[PDB]
Amino acid sequence: ISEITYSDGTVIASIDYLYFTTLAEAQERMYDYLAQRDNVSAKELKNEATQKFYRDLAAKEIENGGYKITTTIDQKIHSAMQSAVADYGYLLDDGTGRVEVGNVLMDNQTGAILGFVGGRNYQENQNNHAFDTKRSPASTTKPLLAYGIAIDQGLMGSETILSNYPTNFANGNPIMYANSKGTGMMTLGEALNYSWNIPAYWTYRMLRENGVDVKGYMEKMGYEIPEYGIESLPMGGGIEVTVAQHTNGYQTLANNGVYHQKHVISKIEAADGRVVYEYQDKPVQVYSKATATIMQGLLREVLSSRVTTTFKSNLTSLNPTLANADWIGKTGTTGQDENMWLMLSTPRLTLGGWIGHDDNHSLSQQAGYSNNSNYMAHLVNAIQQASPSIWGNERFALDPSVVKSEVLKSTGQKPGKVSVEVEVTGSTVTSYWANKSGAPATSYRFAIGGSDADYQNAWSSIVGSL
């Protein structure tokens, strides 16, 4: 009799979401192994009939063999997550009909998946919202694809200034943030905490203009994106992802820039002990340690500022000791309020969460800000109750390689002469950089993005202050 087991060896079942997800993945590994065993070339595997036979063969082999499939799943934690969604899933319902949900809990140092939530109730709806449904990640794309890469390329630091002045897409439409056509200049921290859109637009524009290999970074983390020229890419335009894959992106940032490929199967052995498959770790430095650690600091403030999510307030009430762990994260909300995301990490673990409707109708305005945050606070509390040390008490900290520059608050660059020729001084602040030399001297166009009129307005204001 073949068996699927938890990480510690307890049998899940002989051969709900856990059964089918792990069985499906084991059937794929078995497929690759039987093909290679029988000396079938990848050429011959392009034949549709041959492929179909091998897929069926893999399924029957597990069915009738006596294999032991070891999963990465932690019995107590996964069982805690099930009870949490059973007991607290109703908190998601926001007056737009039953709300669906998916979550993935991943170890930051290995990529192993310790538990997940497939949906509200398998018995009523089988869709797997953790591994199967693909949806836009919205503003949770920003740290990975815009700001993270720009920092990594030495094109901004932690206190760099960006334009949030009104501007239009190529098609002529205003770039909107809810009902605001934008404001003025702002720090990277303010842009992240509020999730403003115009600054991310300008950052990704800067990457395109500089010919940065953005695709290089994203493909190293396993993302598939068809068109890298989309202006709204940092807003989640032109990208769709599963919760499991997107959790792998935040794993990379949390693990000091080092990607480990997500997995739910660690090993498959035959009855006699022959190892027919075993996960092989292939760590990749996607972002520098300086970059990753600088981003951890910015995402810490995203949660603490409580601007786009009530999560920390929800958690501090439920479990004040756990709220004092070093949480960082990012929210996302798509165009018609169709998808809400919240991604969370501590130094040890990352937990991705999505909510939305199977038929893509809109959620309420507050679904992501309040309901999902509350539900996810209950989820993290439940996981901690089942495994008290799992989140850990370590802090994220800046890597030694980070470069610290004294910069003007107003410009985000070093004090100096500028022609408007004028002497620019004032309040200064420490800015973190991931390059060699740190921040440049202040120049006239000091910010990421902005038009001529924007800068006149901006400088009018700075000069008025010396």
Ligand X SMILES: *[B-](O)(O)[C@@H](C)NC(=O)c1c(F)cccc1-c1ccccc1
The distance of closest approach from Cβ of residue 355 to a second copy in the complex, given in angstroms and rounded to an integer, is: 16
Number of amino acids touching Na ion (CB under 5 A): 5
**Residue list 325-354, contact with ligand X (CB under 6 A):** 332-335, 337
Measured CA distances, 401 to 228, 290, 294, 296, 409 (Å): 30, 6, 11, 15, 23
Q: Does 377 bind a second copy (CB under 8 A)?
A: yes
Binding string to Na ion for residues 314 to 333, with x set by CB under 5 A, is what?
-----------------x-x
* E strand spans, 150-308: 161-163, 185-187, 258-259, 265-269, 275-278, 284-285
Pairing of strands 68-71, 3-5: parallel
Crossing angle of helices 17-37 and 48-64, in 10° steps, is 120
Q: Is 139 in the site for ligand X (CB under 6 A)?
A: yes
What is the Cβ-side half-sphere exposure of residue 97, based on CA atoms within 13 angstroms?
11
Q: Quick check: 190 binds ligand X (CB under 6 A)?
A: no
Site string for Na ion, 92-121 (x = CB under 5 A): ------------------------------
Cβ of residue 294: shortest distance to Na ion, in angstroms? 21
415 vs 159, 189, 249, 411, 436, CA distance in Å? 14, 21, 36, 9, 19
Nearer to a second copy, 251 or 370 (CB): 370
**Ramachandran quadrant class, 256 (left: phi over 0; alpha: psi -120 to 50; beta: rest):** left
Which residue type is seen at 251? Q
What span, in angstroms and rounded, lies between the C-alpha atoms of 234 and 202?
10
195 binds Na ion (CB under 5 A): yes
Please tell me whether residue 318 binds a second copy under the rule CB under 8 A. yes
Provide, rounded to whole angstroms, the least separation between the CB of residue 339 and Na ion.
10
CA-CA-CA-CA torsion sign (41, 46, 50, 51): positive
Residue 222 annotated as binding? yes
Residue with structure tokens 């049998």? 11
CA distance 206 to 216: 16
Q: Taking contact as CB under 8 A, which single stretch among the options 110-118, 295-303, 316-324, 341-349 is the one that binds a second copy?
A: 316-324
Q: Are 442 and 415 in contact (CB under 8 A)?
A: yes
Q: Torsion angle, CA of 396/399/403/408, rounded to 10 degrees? A: 10
| Interior angle at CA 17, CA 53 and CA 267, nearest 5 | 60
224 is in an annotated binding site: yes
Name the minimum Å distance from CB 338 to ligand X. Answer: 9
Residue placing its CB nearer to ligand X in the complex, 22 or 197: 197
Work out whether 136 is an interface residue with ligand X (CB under 6 A): no
Residue 333: enclosing H or E segment and its boundaries? strand 328-333
Q: What gap in Å lies between CA 360 and CA 366, rounded to an integer?
A: 17
From 141, 164, 242, 308, residue interacting with Na ion (rule: CB under 5 A) = 308
Give me the least distance between CB of 318 and a second copy, in Å please.
Answer: 5
Of the pair 180, 428, the CB lying nearest ligand X is at 180
Closest distance between a second copy and the C-beta of residue 103, in Å? 17
Contacts with Na ion, residue ranges (CB under 5 A): 139, 195, 308, 331, 333
The residues that touch ligand X, with contacts defined as CB under 6 A, are: 138-139, 177-178, 195, 197, 235, 308, 332-335, 337
Give contact residues for a second copy (rule: CB under 8 A): 91, 306, 310, 313-318, 320, 370, 373-374, 377-378
Residue ranges for the known binding site for Mg(2+) are 222, 224
Tell me which residues touch Cl ion (CB under 5 A).
6-8, 16-18, 20-21, 25, 74-75, 128, 167-168, 206, 214-215, 223-224, 228-229, 231-232, 237, 241, 245, 263-265, 270-272, 288-289, 304, 306, 310, 312-313, 357-359, 397-398, 405-406, 435-437, 448, 451-453
Q: Please state the residue numbers annotated as binding site.
A: 222, 224
